[PDB]
Curated annotation (Swiss-Prot):
It comes from Homo sapiens. Changing N50D: More than 75% inhibition of interferon beta production. Changing R202I: Alters enzyme activity, leading to the appearance of 3'-5' linked cGAMP. Abolishes enzyme activity. This is Cyclic GMP-AMP synthase. The lineage of its organism: Eukaryota, Metazoa, Chordata, Craniata, Vertebrata. The gene is CGAS. Changing K229E: Abolishes stimulation of interferon production. The modification (Microbial infection) Deamidated glutamine is found at Q277, Q280. Its cofactor is Mg(2+); Mn(2+); Zn(2+). Changing K210R: No effect on stimulation of interferon production. Strongly decreased ubiquitination by RNF185.
Amino acid sequence: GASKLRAVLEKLKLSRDDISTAAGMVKGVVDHLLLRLKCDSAFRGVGLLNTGSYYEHVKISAPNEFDVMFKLEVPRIQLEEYSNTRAYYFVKFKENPLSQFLEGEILSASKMLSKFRKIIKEEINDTDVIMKRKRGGSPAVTLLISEKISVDITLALESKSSWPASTQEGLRIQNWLSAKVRKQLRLKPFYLVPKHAEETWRLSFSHIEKEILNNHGKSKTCCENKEEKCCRKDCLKLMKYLLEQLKERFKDKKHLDKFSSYHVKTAFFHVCTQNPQDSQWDRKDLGLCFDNCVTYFLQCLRTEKLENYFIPEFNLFSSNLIDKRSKEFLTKQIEYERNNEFPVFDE
Ligand SMILES: [Zn+2]
């Protein structure tokens, strides 16, 4: 029931101070690294993009892990869609700081990532910060702070052009946040992160995700007063915690390894579109609202369909990305939990 769910939310608050303190340590290192990348020629125009769960106020665990995005203003970008992926692109240009990374027409993510890593390792050595390494094109590089906090740093090109055609039917917020807001948001830049699908880049809208979370009501004053305290953020925190707790019960074989907080977040945005009124997220209806989120996530698993919220034809749950057996496995676990009032949350 809602009492059990409220107890979960109270438990998550116990970790708030550890996360904030660690976030401050990350900021100290990031600020130091950023001011020295301004010295390196290739990345002089780098800037901090304050995206990610901490800045969305929904980081509820893992105080030793942070995702940080650096942006790099890149004038005059023309994109070329890679195959028919809708989310992956080659970067071209209509001097140029990134001129040294061009192979013919195409901007090489491999060459640019290589310099980025090398330049960061050079600046890092010049206090108790070093560079770890993991799997994936983005994050580009990883810092280890005080031999304790791991910061995944993503480099993202910033394009101040209009969003790609593949986003034309995405961001379906008109009945919730308004058509006015949708137009305003689409005048904002978009980002490209280096990401294998080759020298491909993937669209990123983490800045818009943060805006939609921190200004999330139909009412402009949602969550600015006691009469309009909704449970949207609480529901996202509970969905994230549900997935984290289920993953913890398979640390051995990591059967749920393919599922991520980003899947949860994407599904949550879809539920906001489906339930656009603030009265559909009343604080007193926490249990029902959480049920709405869990049942939609279940539907995504069973139908093997979870559309990227900005790029509808990019299906995060296609069997190409996540095998059917893994989705059926998570379906069985979540179904059991839901039908039993979430014993995973029992104390
Ligand atoms: Zn609210």
